[PDB]
Design a protein around this ligand. Structure first.
Ligand SMILES: C[C@@H]1O[C@@H](CC(=O)O)[C@@H](O)[C@H](O)[C@@H]1O
Ligand SMILES: [Ca+2]
Ligand SMILES: [Ca+2]
Length: 114
């Protein structure tokens, strides 16, 4: 199944933050309405924050996370969780190798902000 694609409420600010846990240098692309809105890159095996940013979901609300290592797409896992019908997390893990820890880049999207 498709992973890393989320429908947000339209025209809403959201946070996106990425962590790295891999020997591979991670590139995280965040698309809003099928256009790149943010790109994080970094390398860490200790959960370093490789990027954090505030974006707007725009008129479509469509947000897609992509993860690659030197141009090679990682395999993604994702879900969305809502707490007390208000607080939203869109969660992404990614696997660039064979050990299947799926933490090689970890991406957290959260909304609402403010
Ligand atoms: C240090 C390792 O780097 C990768 C594989 C090679 O090595 C990751 O997929 C592993 O999960 C682990 O973080
Ligand atoms: Ca891995
Ligand atoms: Ca890892």
């Amino acid at each position: 199944a498709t992973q890393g694609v989320f429908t947000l409420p339209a025209n809403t600010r959201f946070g996106v933050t990425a962590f790295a846990n891999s020997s591979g240098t991670q590139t995280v692309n965040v698309l809003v309405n099928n256009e790149t809105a943010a790109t994080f890159s970094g390398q860490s095996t200790n959960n370093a924050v490789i990027g954090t940013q505030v974006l707007n979901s725009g008129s479509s609300g469509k947000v897609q996370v992509q993860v690659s290592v030197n141009g090679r797409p990682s395999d993604l896992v994702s879900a969305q969780v809502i707490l007390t019908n208000e607080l939203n997390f869109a969660l992404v893990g990614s696997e660039d190798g064979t050990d299947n820890d799926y933490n090689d880049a970890v991406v957290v999207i959260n909304w609402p902000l403010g």
